[PDB]
Amino acid sequence: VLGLDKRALWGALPLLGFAIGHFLDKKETERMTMFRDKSALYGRPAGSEGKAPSW
Amino acid sequence: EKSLHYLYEENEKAQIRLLEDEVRRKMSERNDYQAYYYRPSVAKYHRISKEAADELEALRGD
Ligand SMILES: CCCCCCCCCCCC
Ligand SMILES: CCCCCCCC
DSSP, rough: OOOGGGGGGGHHHHHHHHHHHHHHHHHHHHHTTTTSSHHHTOOOOOOOSSSOOOO | OOHHHHHHHHHHHHHHHHHHHHHHHHHHHOOSSSSSOOOOOOOOOHHHHHHHHHHHHHHHOO
């Protein structure tokens, strides 16, 4: 049994901050796209770039 | 690979910071460039006073 009364509707703002931080983490993942497949450990050689990116 | 990208960016930033440290040290050692360590001295006021004394030679008389 939860104990969240009508004052728990204020808590949408920290979840909005969670969404803002998650969006900024996704944008920083998009920013670091150099060496996405060019690394020597997980990178396939040339001629196989037609597939989808890993992340 | 995000660690690889951030390490490449931070290593290039460290290399450029070291290079600009040597560039600033050699610039401040010899005072060569006009930008950072140059203490500007002008001969504008000496030329202005010499020009004014040159015009005052023509106005001497009666
Ligand atoms: C006392 C009423 C509290 C809920 C309404 C005011 C706060 C709304 C916050 C909305 C965040 C997205
Ligand atoms: C500190 C940034 C707050 C606003 C983020 C907006 C993202 C769409």
